[PDB]
Structure 1
Amino acid sequence: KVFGRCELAAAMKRHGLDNYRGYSLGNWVCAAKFESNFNTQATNRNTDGSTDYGILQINSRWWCNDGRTPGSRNLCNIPCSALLSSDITASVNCAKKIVSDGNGMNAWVAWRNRCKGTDVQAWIRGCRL
């Protein structure tokens, strides 16, 4: 499912991400935009052999099991395919563990390079929230 911007903002709000660990909702929508272009089915393979999965491009070396990343830790205790669902609940639950891990949203490279320090409020403007 390719989400609409305001559609994704409402689903992320319902799931408790607005101001989760201090990060306002616009940060999360910006991160989804640049990590996956709002597409739940996005996957991208990395040089170390791990793969990033879903709307927030969660990585198989640490967070989910895909059966082909040697020494994967599977900290969200889910198969990575669960992260490609039209229902974003597993992606949101795992993202909450990731953002709690110490480095905050700097865990997402597209957030640090394209969202951090910009006016992220623009990502939810015009939405009925």
Structure 2
Amino acid sequence: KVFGRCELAAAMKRHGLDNYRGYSLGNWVCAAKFESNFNTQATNRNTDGSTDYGILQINSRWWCNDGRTPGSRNLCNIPCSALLSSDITASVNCAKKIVSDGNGMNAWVAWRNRCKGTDVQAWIRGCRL
């Protein structure tokens, strides 16, 4: 499923993600924007031997598991495919848990430099809610 700006904003709010631990929707939207463009299908692939599933892209080795990743640990204790729900609730639930290890989002490559050092309004401007 896909998630437009206003929909994702309302969703991120109903989930209590806006400013969650400080991570304002601007950070989540900017990150999710270039990562999967708010999509519950845009999947990525890691060469080490893992794959990322979920709107915000979650690795099946340290964040979640899929049952095929050649050797996985899982720190979120969750099924990666579930992160592709039609509701961000799946990834938001694991994200709200993952954003509490110590590195937080200091790993997602897009957010790392495209957001953690750019702007946090261009990803919310408009859906002033």
Task: Assess same fold via TM > 0.5.
Answer: yes
In the TM superposition, residue 29 of structure 1 has moved relative to its aligned partner by: 0.9
Detail structure 1 runs of 4+ shifted over 6 Å in the superposition.
Answer: none
1:99–1:107: 8 Å Cα contact kept in structure 2? Answer: no
More helix by share: 1
In the TM superposition, residue 112 of structure 1 has moved relative to its aligned partner by: 0.8
In the TM superposition, residue 6 of structure 1 has moved relative to its aligned partner by: 1.4
Q: What SS does the corresponding residue of 1:105 show, helix, strand or coil?
A: coil
Q: What SS does the corresponding residue of 1:104 show, helix, strand or coil?
A: coil
Aligned-residue identity in percent? 100
Q: What SS does the corresponding residue of 1:106 show, helix, strand or coil?
A: coil
Where structure 1 has 5 or more consecutive residues not aligned to the other structure, the ranges are: none
Q: Which moved more, 1:84-93 or 1:113-122?
A: 113-122
The alignment's TM-score, normalised by the length of structure 2, stands at 0.92
Summarize deviations over 1:10-43 as a string: whole Å, max 9, x none. 1011101111112212111111101101111111
Where structure 2 has 5 or more consecutive residues not aligned to the other structure, the ranges are: none
CA distance in 1, matches of 2:63, 2:118: 28
The alignment's TM-score, normalised by the length of structure 1, stands at 0.92
Q: Give the CA RMSD over aligned residues.
A: 1.3
CA distance in 2, matches of 1:71, 1:88: 26
In the TM superposition, residue 107 of structure 1 has moved relative to its aligned partner by: 2.1
Q: How does 1:103-118 map to 2 (within 5 A)?
A: 103-118=103-118
